[PDB]
């Protein structure tokens with residue numbers, strides 16, 4: 368256990384760092400400081416303003432089982448109050464189809480879903496635990512498609528792909544099942560399939576800005592950390608404006624990047640070097656022939672269509688001059704990765720093909736997205752190692768790499784970090 372008097376440095380004012388501060392504070396750890404590199408809080412919950420309304424450059428949605436986020440809202444006073452999500456499906460040629468009504472493929476898919484639900488309820492019990500420290504079944508360490516194939520459930524990929532590949536998380540040929548099924552566990556998949564999805568009028572960012580404000584120590588912003596060292600049982604942080612000592616270090620920032628400004632030991636260097644991530648690019652667009660509904664494009668979710676628009680978000684139905692965001696991936700382990708420029712051109716051409724041509728791109732962002740490890744590295748015990756290192760030289764590891772790249776998962780992980788190590 369850790370002394371309540373400890374000076375605790377939390378790096379990153381995204382959901383993970385903000386949650387860490389919240390749950391530390393509610394456990395009686397009052398001497399924490401959150402250090403944020405940018406001038407803003409919420410990280411990839413990022414909801415900029417346009418014509419009196421906030422649009423989403425990052426996270427958009429939750430589901431009713433996001434219990435930790437509910438706890439945050441309980442604290443902040445925020446309410447789930449955004450516009451209803453609705454979707455149609457488009458082929459890569461822009462034609463509308465209704466796959467749930469396909470009388471051959473539909474049943475095959477839902478039968479596979481049924482079958483997978485029972486394997487999850489019986490054989491793979493534990494799969495849905497937050498984090499990876501409870502070692503998942505070995506089958507879950509395989510790429511999702513391989514995991515499905517082993518169990519005869521390939522068809523279920525049709526349901527699972529839409530809120531996964533399109534949402535930036537990569538491709539089932541390579542992404543381990545462990546990640547997929549921690550995010551899209553059975554209740555979560557059911558909620559999404561049904562459209563029972565939380566959104567916020569003021570943006571996902573708002574409740575995090577509000578959480579920060581409720582904190583006893585709101586985040587320090589514009590903190591440029593040049594160096595962290597950990598001699599003599601302490602943590603020393605060097606920034607461009609000061610350098611100070613803490614007792615405990617909580618990392619919610621990318622761990623491979625941490626290597627470059629830290630006295631990283633051999634294990635840290637070895638293991639964090641294996642972290643891979645996604646290049647998920649979002650374009651905030653003004654369009655003609657305004658869509659009446661969000662569009663998903665499964666055809667463009669295939670690795671062979673890397674860089675094409677996989678989904679676009681219809682957020683403000685009443686105003687045809689409001690922002691439509693588009694979503695595409697720029698990388699895949701087995702395909703040549705795509706440039707920003709050539710992908711920008713695909714946004715334009717695909718949106719035209721869909722009959723919603725772009726008048727203007729007002730904002731573009733390639734995000735550092737979904738840090739994870741390969742199936743091989745997962746099977747080789749990556750998480751047993753790294754979780755084994757928790758508390759080493761008073762350093763604790765958290766954020767997306769330790770759980771999943773979603774704001775409930777990381778917040779939940781931070782909450783549990785306090786329980787596991789601090790209380």
Ligand SMILES: Cc1cc2nc3c(=O)[nH]c(=O)nc-3n(C[C@H](O)[C@H](O)[C@H](O)COP(=O)(O)OP(=O)(O)OC[C@H]3O[C@@H](n4cnc5c(N)ncnc54)[C@H](O)[C@@H]3O)c2cc1C
Nearest residue numbers: 379381382383404410411425426427428766767772773774
């Ligand atoms: C387009 C898009 C769609 C998404 N959709 C959803 C969704 O619908 N549902 C969902 O649950 N999640 C979604 N997400 C994922 C979700 O937003 C993230 O998983 C969540 O924000 C992770 O929180 P975090 O604190 O772990 O990481 P981040 O949000 O990335 O926050 C990291 C923070 O650390 C800071 N930082 C980085 N480096 C340093 C440094 N050197 N020093 C100090 N500070 C540093 C950053 O500025 C940032 O504030 C989406 C994200 C994007 C981009």
Ligand SMILES: [Cl-]
Nearest residue numbers: 369370371372
């Ligand atoms: Cl104490």
Ligand SMILES: [Cl-]
Nearest residue numbers: 452453454661
């Ligand atoms: Cl949707």
